[PDB]
Write a protein that binds this ligand. Structure first.
Ligand SMILES: CCCCCCCCCCCCCCCCCC(=O)OC[C@H](COP(=O)([O-])OCC(O)COP(=O)([O-])OC[C@@H](COC(=O)CCCCCCCCCCCCCCCCC)OC(=O)CCCCCCCCCCCCCCCCC)OC(=O)CCCCCCCCCCCCCCCCC
Ligand SMILES: CCCCCCCCCCCCCCCCCC(=O)OC[C@H](COP(=O)([O-])OCC(O)COP(=O)([O-])OC[C@@H](COC(=O)CCCCCCCCCCCCCCCCC)OC(=O)CCCCCCCCCCCCCCCCC)OC(=O)CCCCCCCCCCCCCCCCC
Ligand SMILES: CCCCCCCCCCCCCCCCCC(=O)OC[C@H](COP(=O)([O-])OCC(O)COP(=O)([O-])OC[C@@H](COC(=O)CCCCCCCCCCCCCCCCC)OC(=O)CCCCCCCCCCCCCCCCC)OC(=O)CCCCCCCCCCCCCCCCC
Ligand SMILES: CCCCCCCCCCCCCCCCCC(=O)OC[C@H](COP(=O)([O-])OCC(O)COP(=O)([O-])OC[C@@H](COC(=O)CCCCCCCCCCCCCCCCC)OC(=O)CCCCCCCCCCCCCCCCC)OC(=O)CCCCCCCCCCCCCCCCC
Ligand SMILES: COC1=C(OC)C(=O)C(C/C=C(\C)CC/C=C(\C)CC/C=C(\C)CC/C=C(\C)CC/C=C(\C)CC/C=C(/C)CC/C=C(\C)CCC=C(C)C)=C(C)C1=O
Ligand SMILES: CCCCCCCC/C=C/CCCCCCCC(=O)OC[C@H](COP(=O)(O)OCCN)OC(=O)CCCCCCC/C=C/CCCCCCCC
Lengths: 119, 185, 149, 99, 209, 221, 269, 49, 37, 119, 49, 23
């Protein structure tokens, strides 16, 4: 689990595997696509996957779930939120049980002890 | 015959043998490659005299020049330009590559044919040595900003600090702030 | 890189054939102690062990054991000293192990290329190059800058 | 695995300029003294070393060359044969190799 | 016809007699072969390279005469000879200087002729067999001093080892089998004599000194 | 197939011929298996000798200069000389025009100035190259002698004598080795095993966990 | 200041030995003629190198000579499988682009090499050993950390693996020691005293007869009568030795769908 | 200094290194160590770059 | 040993006489790939 | 060392490295290129590198070492012999200290013990 | 049966597998096992081919 | 390493025919 608003982009990249995905920060530009009026505090936009969640609620309050919520600005927020929590759950588990897969871990490329050098 | 190969060594002592055949006084002033220049340059000089043959028929000299080209192509190989290189077998002596013995990458390229592994990669040591950036001159008339800016630049003395790696020029790395305009392909 | 290129060139090959007594690639020690081992002698088996140790020395082409850096008993210059002091194979095999253990890397297997290529730096090759470009430039003039007709 | 992949252990800052990718700066880079300043600073050291650091030098150089040998038994042989019967621990203290 | 062709004639004078008089008319194939390799004035014997030079020499020279034949920039400064207002007088000596610089066109052709090539990267590739190298190959180098000084050092030290090696072999020949099998031997070794046999003491199997 | 000459010698191919039938010919190959393990072990008991004897230590700071080989570019100097000669031919071939036509006066006047500067560059570079080559040749010879007189003493060490005595013991030992029979069995070298074992037992302790102990200046191959 | 000459110049005493490997009359006669005029011939090329002049290699007619590459079965097909056999032809046929590509290193051998560790990493190792033999191991922590920090990781991996290799070779050498120093049943209780005063020559053909009938004149005076009698005596001894025969064992490789054992092959099919 | 401290991932091929299963069968049981997580890579003095 | 320490575990000389029957395994330079067209 | 006349080629091919060389049997065809008469027994032609050695001797007896030994049939035999013993010396060492590199070795891809499978 | 017994060399990347240097720092010291040199690969019954 | 490389554990015999390669 991430206990902050920010995370080093390299700490979630693979060292011995091809990097085909990143774990980007929340896309704040999607918040300005909502045409209606809403109140959002800047203190909630950086934490992972939450901004997409609040946007989904705003869209489900202004519109409903039938024939009015089906507009591009609102469906992309629902998709980003559903996708952000799925990737973060997978990266979080991979961080818990496979920390040696990521850059920055000392077990990705273990440094030998001095007794292993024969000096 | 095996004893005839050692005739000049039986009349000499070990110190005389070393001073004779091993400790040859260094003299790197000779034009050793004159042997190759004379031999291969003779093809051109021979063509000067051969192109003046008093043969009357034009197509008979076509045959002569076809035979002369065959003599050359045994060494040059490919008749088209910018296609390949000639092939000359030369004698092996202690002075082969004498002025590049100090360079390590030249030895690896000439001598070693490395065996690719399952983890198909260049050796990490070879990759690491290859990233130590080389030195690239600042003088550049190919980029028009430097063609103008370097006319007002002041060449100041670079006082030697006791090293052999003083980066008094830019570095041959694509990510260098003074070499990013250069295309590394 | 992008630099000057010639139209026609020659590449030399300093071949280490080992069958030519005309140059320094002739292994005088191997051929003498081999022929020496063919004749019946009391040291006939000793000379064989010597030749086998000499081959284990050629097999170790390390920075400290190679002809490129002109090391003793590995370069063409010091090939005759084997005829006088064949006992130094053990000193070599041990020396290379000392420097390899402390100051060297992993012992990797590679194929040692005996063919030693070298581009011959000649004078007449650039004359031929200029003539070819002189023909190319004249055609540029013959086709586009010829006003004689 | 991307061929142009590199793992760097020091911070780098990449320029966000169109059509170019390069390292424009290094975080917390301090500009030290100029080449002329270091030149003047070194000349003061070499000048003193030339005037007051040349007596009794031949002995110290022999000690330094003896300690550049591979094995310890060869060092003791070098000290006793070349340095006039010196001691291993006593010479190492002069050269500054002792703790 | 030129002098070099006439020189061939005096050398090939007897050969011409054999081909043109005897072979060129004997009969059958020997005739067709002799009339084909006849000796005489060259058909289509012109040399286009010679002519290419004569043409380009003349055309470039007519340009030199124009570029070099300019009114002086110095004389136009006084406003007393032939030039009062010349707002581009400072361009008078550009073409002359450009033609005189053309004399170094071939002297300085290519990179190797403008500098000391062994200090440049392309030289390393030529000596490596026209092979691609990493750009930093000029820096990864072992000292040339060591390579040459060590090459001399090893030999000067071998001449001294040969003398030490002889004194050791001599002193050992006068040693007893017990001494040469226990000295420098392992402490846990117990010496047990072996049957005496005839084994010569030959320094060099090859009859060398 | 290592130890080629040793195996060929033990089989007797230097004096006789193998049996023409595979049964005995193959048994004769397997008969030397013991002797190879012995002669290989003997070759790994050589004592050490100073590495700084015929080889300067390449890790010494003296060699941090990373000096290059100064050369003379003969081919470059010859081409630029031939190109300069080409200009003199161009002037000679066009002498009447350069000399009598006033439109070419500037070339007639300044052609020799440019030619001298070209010659100066050619000869300057060749001359400078020649000087640097001589400074290099005379230094490597002088510095080589200073290092010899400095390290001559290493040949007086007793380890050099210990090395030669081991080499001679191996010579006398292998000279005594002999084929005892031709039954195509390992017993054909029955007595030779004892001779070599005495040699190995003379420089090792068989009753140890590792009779062959590792040290960086030892034998592995 | 005379140029230096190599040892090969004193074998031939000339720089112009016109050695041509092509054994055709036209070639060897021209070489003998050219070999005699090399002193006053402008079209002369050296084949013995020197300090002042390089040389050419062995000549093959108008072209150059190089031995046939040592047979190598490795090849790469382009259009169809050729089944290249390096032992089926004397000289290796040229490689056609659409037919075959041969393995690299026409003239190459197998050697073992090692990379040279970085200079700064070497200096940290020298300082550790020096501080070790002077001050001891327990007072070299700072010098040990400099190694782990300055030496790049690819070097620490090499250093780590060198120890494992030499540990492996150390065992492989001691196992040979054990097999070599093992006392067989035919040498139990025998010491250097039971050894004979013989040398290598005493096991050769002159002193020890080989196991062949025509090595010497031993059986040259034997008649058919003596043979028939000997055939009767050997059969007599076989009346006591043929009584025993090893029993047939089971075939470990009976199942064809099982990885067979690389058992010793029979002498004959 | 940055390129001195610029390494590549995965190092060299492990299958070309000495195996632990082979040392056990040779008479040497290898000991397992832990990763050295306390050392920080640093570049040497400028003269060595 | 000679002023040098090489740390190694206790060597088992019994591993020398380890019965290792050789097994068949052939390498085929030129075989089958994963997918074909 | 090889203690037989025949060896399995696969036993001298690498399992985890590209195979660029083989260890071929003696080239018996080169023996028919010697123009002179000689005696050769079939019992000595299969053992590694010995055929090329005997051929070199036959050629050095008929001819010498100067201007007559320099013919293609004799130089290829000397080159083969010199090359055969060098390759076999390296392969023999590689077989002694790197048996895990070759096919057929049980250490090239070790089979695990049943205690490591967790059953 | 031959293709069932036709394997490819080198298996998979060991770097994608659990490290022994990591298990130590996690609290489990792995035990080093030797190679099983006595097992012969065989094909199953035809029904499983 | 060669892409068309396979390790087989049971014996196989290959045909020595021109233009074809099979068991
Ligand atoms: C007073 C009147 C005179 C009376 C006297 C008359 C008698 C005169 C003869 C005696 C005196 C001769 C003086 C010189 C000594 C030479 C002795 C000798 O044995 O030489 C044999 C000489 C060398 O033998 P070689 O070792 O086999 O080398 C040739 C190989 O081809 C080489 O093969 P390669 O692959 O090993 O090498 C390739 C080669 C390149 O070789 C080739 O490309 C040629 C290949 C042949 C053509 C290809 C087709 C194949 C043809 C085959 C069939 C030919 C049959 C010919 C039979 C002729 C029989 C003799 O390149 C080189 O290796 C280096 C060559 C460049 C080096 C520098 C050369 C300096 C020459 C100096 C010239 C000085 C004279 C001035 C020249 C003229 C000025 C206008 O063979 C020749 O006959 C060469 C013929 C070339 C034609 C010469 C034409 C000019 C002659 C000038 C004569 C004097 C001036 C005349 C003025 C006119 C009024 C009088
Ligand atoms: C739709 C139909 C059309 C389709 C057509 C077909 C399509 C094309 C198919 C292509 C097929 C593949 C091509 C071959 C593959 C290999 C390519 C290759 O590797 O090239 C690398 C090679 C590397 O050069 P690079 O990468 O381009 O540049 C790097 C370096 O700069 C290079 O080295 P650098 O830095 O040392 O050079 C410095 C520079 C130094 O230059 C200077 O500093 C100042 C310039 C001085 C010029 C002096 C000229 C020399 C003689 C002067 C003597 C008279 C003096 C007059 C007064 C002078 C005043 C100062 O020197 C020069 O390069 C001088 C170049 C002179 C060229 C003439 C000037 C006019 C421009 C060319 C116009 C004609 C071509 C256009 C054709 C258009 C047709 C539609 O490329 C070449 O430069 C060579 C060009 C020729 C390559 C093709 C050869 C094909 C082989 C068969 C033809 C053989 C020629 C026979 C001609 C017979 C005529 C009857
Ligand atoms: C000791 C030995 C024994 C000696 C004793 C024997 C004595 C017998 C002597 C016999 C004959 C001697 C020949 C000379 C006597 C001539 C008397 C006469 O009546 O002739 C009239 C004669 C009649 O005209 P013509 O016959 O119809 O045609 C004459 C020419 O063919 C073409 O005529 P043109 O007028 O068309 O040529 C013009 C050309 C003439 O060529 C030159 O003379 C080169 C001029 C270069 C110097 C320009 C000075 C600019 C003012 C700068 C002020 C500061 C100066 C500080 C200098 C410090 C130096 C480090 O000058 C130009 O190109 C004008 C444009 C200048 C460039 C445009 C931009 C200028 C401003 C740039 C400012 C940059 C500043 C940036 C930063 C500033 C911050 C403060 O005109 C002549 O002047 C003849 C000159 C012949 C060439 C002489 C030089 C030969 C080259 C020798 C090698 C170089 C050594 C000298 C280098 C000097 C320093 C660079
Ligand atoms: C398949 C590709 C093959 C490629 C390889 C082969 C290439 C072959 C191309 C050959 C083209 C060049 C010709 C080379 C010579 C071959 C013989 C020949 O010329 O053709 C037959 C030629 C007949 O011409 P043709 O084409 O049959 O038809 C005639 C035309 O219809 C009407 O007659 P014309 O007189 O009006 O026409 C003159 C004719 C022929 O004119 C000639 O006579 C050619 C003269 C060439 C120069 C020779 C002297 C060069 C300096 C020698 C320095 C010696 C250094 C060593 C000193 C000793 C200490 C080590 O055409 C030429 O001039 C061609 C010249 C081409 C340009 C050469 C200069 C370009 C320089 C650009 C930079 C390039 C740098 C490399 C240059 C390398 C130079 C070494 O024979 C003669 O002309 C006989 C002349 C007899 C009297 C000459 C007395 C000696 C004169 C010496 C020069 C004196 C002036 C001052 C020199 C000062 C030096 C310091
Ligand atoms: C001075 O003012 C100027 C002019 O005058 C107005 C110009 O024309 C020009 C224009 C220049 C030109 C049109 C010439 C351009 C020439 C170019 C581009 C190069 C020409 C190249 C060739 C013709 C090919 C030559 C090939 C070679 C030399 C290679 C093979 C070697 C050969 C043929 C010669 C052998 C070499 C030797 C060293 C031996 C020399 C032999 C002799 C001297 C024998 C001579 C024999 C006789 C009988 C005279 C300029 C630039 C100029 O500045
Ligand atoms: C009238 C003279 C006209 C000459 C042309 C005018 C311009 C002159 C420019 C002069 C520039 C001088 C700068 C120095 C250049 C250096 C040349 C060089 O290095 O040559 C070296 C080297 C010396 O050999 P080494 O002993 O190994 O080296 C020792 C070094 N001390 O010289 C050579 O390469 C030999 C070849 C010289 C040039 C070619 C000679 C042939 C000339 C062709 C024309 C002659 C035709 C007639 C020949 C007669 C044949 C029977």
């Amino acid at each position: 689990t991430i206990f902050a608003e920010t995370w080093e982009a390299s700490e979630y990249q693979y060292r011995n595997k091809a990097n085909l995905k990143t774990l980007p920060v929340n896309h704040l530009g999607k918040l300005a696509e909502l045409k209606f009026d809403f109140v959002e505090y800047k203190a909630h936009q950086l934490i992972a996957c939450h901004l997409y969640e609040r946007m989904t609620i705003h869209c489900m309050n202004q519109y409903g779930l039938f024939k009015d919520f089906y507009r591009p600005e609102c469906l992309d927020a629902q998709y980003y939120f559903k996708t952000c929590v799925e990737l973060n759950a997978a990266y979080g588990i991979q961080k818990k049980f496979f920390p040696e897969h990521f850059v920055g871990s000392p077990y990705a490329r273990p440094v030998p002890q001095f007794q292993q050098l024969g000096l | 015959d095996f004893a005839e190969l050692l005739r000049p060594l039986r009349s000499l002592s070990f110190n005389q043998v070393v001073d004779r055949y091993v400790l040859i006084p260094p003299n790197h002033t000779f034009y050793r490659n004159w042997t190759y220049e004379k031999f291969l340059g003779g093809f051109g000089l021979s063509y000067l005299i051969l192109r003046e043959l008093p043969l009357r028929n034009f197509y008979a000299r076509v045959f002569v020049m076809y035979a002369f080209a065959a003599k050359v192509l045994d060494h040059l190989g490919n008749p088209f330009p910018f296609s390949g290189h000639g092939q000359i077998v030369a004698a092996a002596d202690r002075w082969n590559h004498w002025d590049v013995r100090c360079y390590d990458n030249v030895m690896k390229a000439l001598k070693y044919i490395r065996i690719p592994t399952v983890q198909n990669n260049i050796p990490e040591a070879t990759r690491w040595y290859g990233r130590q950036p080389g030195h690239l001159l600042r003088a550049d008339t190919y980029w028009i900003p430097n063609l103008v800016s370097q006319r007002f630049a002041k060449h100041q003395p670079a006082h030697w600090d006791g090293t052999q790696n003083m980066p008094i020029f830019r570095l041959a790395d694509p990510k260098h702030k003074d070499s990013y305009m250069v295309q590394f392909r | 890189t992008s630099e000057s290129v010639l139209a026609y060139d020659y590449k030399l090959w300093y071949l280490w054939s080992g069958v030519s007594n005309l140059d320094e690639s002739f292994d005088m020690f191997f051929n003498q102690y081999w022929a020496l081992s063919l004749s019946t002698s009391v040291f006939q088996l000793f000379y064989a062990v010597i030749l086998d140790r000499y081959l284990s020395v050629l097999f170790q082409n390390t920075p400290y054991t190679n002809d490129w850096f002109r090391m003793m008993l590995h370069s063409k210059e010091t090939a005759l000293i084997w005829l006088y002091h064949p006992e130094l194979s053990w000193h070599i095999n041990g020396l290379n192990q000392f420097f390899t253990y402390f100051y060297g890397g992993i012992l990797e297997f590679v194929y040692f290329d005996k063919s030693n290529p070298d581009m011959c730096i000649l004078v007449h090759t650039l004359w031929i190059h200029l003539l070819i470009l002189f023909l190319i430039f004249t055609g540029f003039v013959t086709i586009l800058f010829s006003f004689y007709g | 695995m991307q061929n142009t992949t590199n793992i760097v252990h020091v911070p780098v800052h990449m320029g966000h300029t169109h059509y170019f990718d390069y390292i424009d700066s290094f975080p917390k880079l301090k500009e030290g003294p100029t080449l002329e300043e270091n030149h003047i600073t070194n000349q003061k050291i070499l000048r003193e070393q030339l005037i007051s650091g040349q007596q009794g030098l031949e002995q110290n150089l022999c000690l330094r060359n003896c300690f550049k040998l591979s094995q310890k038994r060869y060092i003791e042989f070098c000290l006793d044969r070349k340095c006039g019967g010196a001691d291993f621990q006593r010479a190492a203290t002069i050269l500054g190799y002792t703790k | 016809m030129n002098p070099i062709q006439k020189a061939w004639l005096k050398i090939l004078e007897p050969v011409s007699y054999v081909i043109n008089e005897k072979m060129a008319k004997r009969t059958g194939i020997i005739g067709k072969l002799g009339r084909f390799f006849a000796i005489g004035p060259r058909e289509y014997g012109v040399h286009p390279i010679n002519r290419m030079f004569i043409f380009m020499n003349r055309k470039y020279m007519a340009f030199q005469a124009v570029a070099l034949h300019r009114y002086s920039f110095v004389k136009s400064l006084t406003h007393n000879g032939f030039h009062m207002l010349r707002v581009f007088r400072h361009f008078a000596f550009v073409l002359p200087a450009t033609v005189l610089a053309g004399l170094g066109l071939f002297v300085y052709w290519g990179d190797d002729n403008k500098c000391y090539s062994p200090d440049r990267f392309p030289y390393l590739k030529k000596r490596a067999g026209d092979m691609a190298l990493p750009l930093n190959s000029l820096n990864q180098r072992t000292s040339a001093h060591y390579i040459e000084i060590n090459a001399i050092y090893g030999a000067e030290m071998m001449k001294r080892y040969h003398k030490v090696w002889e004194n050791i072999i001599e002193e050992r020949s006068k040693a007893t089998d017990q001494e040469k099998k226990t000295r420098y031997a392992h402490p846990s070794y117990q010496y047990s004599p072996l049957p005496v046999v005839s084994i010569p003491n030959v320094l060099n199997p090859l009859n060398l000194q | 197939m290592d130890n080629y000459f040793t195996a060929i010698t033990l089989l007797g191919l230097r004096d006789q011929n193998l049996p023409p039938f595979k049964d005995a010919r193959l048994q004769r190959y397997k008969s030397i298996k013991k002797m190879i393990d012995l002669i290989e072990t003997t070759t790994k008991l050589a004592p050490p000798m100073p590495v700084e004897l015929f080889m300067l230590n390449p890790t010494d700071p003296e060699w941090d200069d990373d000096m290059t080989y100064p050369t003379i570019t003969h081919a470059t100097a010859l081409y630029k000389s031939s190109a300069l000669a080409g200009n003199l031919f161009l002037y000679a071939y066009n002498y009447n025009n350069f000399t009598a036509n006033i439109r070419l006066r500037t070339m007639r006047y300044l052609f020799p100035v440019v030619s001298l500067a070209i010659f100066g560059n050619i000869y300057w570079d060749y001359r400078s190259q020649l000087v640097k080559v001589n400074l290099f040749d005379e230094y490597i010879q002088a510095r080589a002698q200073e290092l010899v007189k400095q390290n001559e003493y290493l040949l007086e060490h007793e380890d050099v004598k210990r090395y030669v005595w081991w080499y001679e013991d191996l010579k006398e030992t292998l000279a005594r080795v002999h084929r005892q029979a031709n039954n195509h069995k390992a017993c054909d070298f029955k007595d030779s095993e004892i001779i070599l074992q005495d040699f190995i037992r003379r420089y090792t302790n068989p009753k140890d966990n590792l009779p062959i102990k590792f040290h960086p200046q030892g034998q592995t191959f | 200041k005379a140029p230096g000459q190599i040892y090969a110049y004193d074998i031939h005493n000339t720089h112009y030995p016109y050695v041509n490997i092509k054994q055709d009359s036209q070639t060897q006669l021209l070489a003998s003629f050219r070999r005699s005029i090399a002193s006053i011939n402008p079209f002369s090329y050296r084949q013995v190198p020197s300090q002042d002049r390089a040389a050419f290699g062995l000549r093959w007619g108008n072209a150059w000579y190089a031995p046939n590459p040592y047979p190598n079965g490795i090849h790469f097909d382009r259009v169809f499988p050729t089944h290249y056999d390096p032992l089926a032809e004397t000289n290796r046929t040229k490689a056609n682009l659409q037919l075959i590509k041969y393995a690299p290193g026409n003239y190459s051998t197998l050697v073992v090499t090692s990379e040279k560790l970085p200079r700064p990493c070497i200096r940290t190792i020298q300082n550790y050993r020096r501080c070790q033999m002077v001050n001891g191991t327990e007072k070299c922590n700072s010098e040990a950390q400099d190694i782990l920090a300055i030496c790049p990781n690819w070097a620490l991996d090499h250093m780590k693996e060198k120890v494992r290799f030499y540990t492996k070779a150390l065992a492989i050498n001691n196992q040979t020691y054990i097999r070599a120093m093992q006392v067989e049943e035919y040498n139990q209780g025998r010491t250097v005293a039971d050894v004979a005063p013989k040398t290598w020559i005493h096991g050769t053909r002159q002193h020890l007869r080989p196991d062949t009938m025509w090595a010497d004149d031993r059986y040259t005076n034997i008649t058919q009568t003596e043979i028939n009698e000997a055939i009767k005596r050997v059969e007599a001894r076989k009346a006591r030795e043929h009584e025993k025969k090893p029993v047939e064992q089971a075939n470990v490789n009976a199942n064809t769908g099982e990885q067979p054992v690389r058992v010793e092959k029979s002498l004959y099919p | 200094r940055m390129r001195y401290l610029t390494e590549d991932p995965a190092g060299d091929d492990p299958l070309q290194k000495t195996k632990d299963e082979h040392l056990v069968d040779l008479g040497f049981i290898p000991k397992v160590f832990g990763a050295n997580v306390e050392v920080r890579k640093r570049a040497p003095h400028d003269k060595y770059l | 040993y000679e002023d040098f320490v090489f740390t190694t575990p206790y060597f088992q000389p019994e591993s020398t006489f380890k019965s290792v029957p050789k097994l068949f395994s052939d390498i085929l330079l030129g075989g089958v790939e994963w997918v074909y067209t």
